Design an enzyme around this catalytic site. Sequence first.
Site, PDB file in Angstrom:
ATOM      1  N   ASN A  85       0.837  -1.193   0.000  1.00 10.95           N
ATOM      2  CA  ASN A  85       0.000   0.000   0.000  1.00 10.95           C
ATOM      3  C   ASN A  85       0.874   1.245   0.000  1.00 10.95           C
ATOM      4  O   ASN A  85       1.880   1.305   0.711  1.00 10.95           O
ATOM      5  CB  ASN A  85      -0.864   0.047   1.257  1.00 10.95           C
ATOM      6  CG  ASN A  85      -1.868  -1.082   1.331  1.00 10.95           C
ATOM      7  OD1 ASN A  85      -2.322  -1.587   0.304  1.00 10.95           O
ATOM      8  ND2 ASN A  85      -2.238  -1.471   2.548  1.00 10.95           N
ATOM      9  N   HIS A  98       6.251  -2.192   3.542  1.00  8.25           N
ATOM     10  CA  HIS A  98       5.935  -3.535   4.008  1.00  8.25           C
ATOM     11  C   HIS A  98       5.096  -4.277   2.981  1.00  8.25           C
ATOM     12  O   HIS A  98       4.178  -3.708   2.380  1.00  8.25           O
ATOM     13  CB  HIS A  98       5.272  -3.556   5.409  1.00  8.25           C
ATOM     14  CG  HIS A  98       4.069  -2.671   5.561  1.00  8.25           C
ATOM     15  ND1 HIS A  98       4.154  -1.296   5.631  1.00  8.25           N
ATOM     16  CD2 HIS A  98       2.758  -2.974   5.723  1.00  8.25           C
ATOM     17  CE1 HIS A  98       2.943  -0.789   5.793  1.00  8.25           C
ATOM     18  NE2 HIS A  98       2.078  -1.786   5.848  1.00  8.25           N
TER      19      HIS A  98
HETATM   20 CL   LIG Z   1      -0.363  -0.867   4.848  1.00  4.18          CL
END
Ligand SMILES: [Cl-]
Lengths: 112, 115
Positions: A85, A98
Amino acid sequence: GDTIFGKIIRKEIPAKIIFEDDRCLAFHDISPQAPTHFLVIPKKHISQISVAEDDDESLLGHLMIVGKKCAADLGLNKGYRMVVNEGSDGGQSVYHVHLHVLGGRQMHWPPG
Amino acid sequence: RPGGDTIFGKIIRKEIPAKIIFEDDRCLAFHDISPQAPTHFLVIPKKHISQISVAEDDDESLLGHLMIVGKKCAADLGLNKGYRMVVNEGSDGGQSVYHVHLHVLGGRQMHWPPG
Ligand SMILES: [Cl-]
Ligand SMILES: CCNC(=O)OC[C@H]1O[C@@H](n2cnc3c(=O)[nH]c(N)nc32)[C@H](O)[C@@H]1O
């Protein structure tokens, strides 16, 4: 600025670690969205994928190879979904890059 | 044939048309025909790899290159509020084309969980 993932890398707070090497760490997500939901993070503090550099390509690919190896070790033989994201619209929750890996159930479309 | 005969291999070889955003010697970025967000494109290697679960250790740089190209294309497309990158593996992952690919979606708020 530091983040909670920095604390996890530094072993200052507990996490259920799946795998570690000299350049990344994989651990189960504290707010799992599937029966298996873990993260693979670089030890280098890249705040978000939009600021990664060309020289980071090997490291980013390493997160995905580690992620797929951990998924196999965790028994995800029917498949899984990997997610990164970026920013507000991406729903990015911690400003340390991540890779989410989710499986153990049918993942649906659209992916959010 | 180089790239294989999935739809993505055909697109790589210009045998099926696509709306191409970026192309280099290692990958191709093109818009998804069934977009799930106002902007939704794919970044694929030119080398045929069926799925991430079978990628080789020496594929690391290529896989990372997909993400770097993905984020550069997102910026060039004006996705200044962010985006989501997705790799689907196998049946539970929702994979429908067995040629490795990175989805990039943006232009709206993405929700959690990601499917
Ligand atoms: Cl995230
Ligand atoms: C369902 C998600 N799991 C997955 O495996 O995604 C594969 C993705 O490939 C897309 N696609 C399929 N055929 C074509 C095509 O001829 N042209 C284009 N430009 N995109 C295509 C499809 O819409 C899907 O999002």
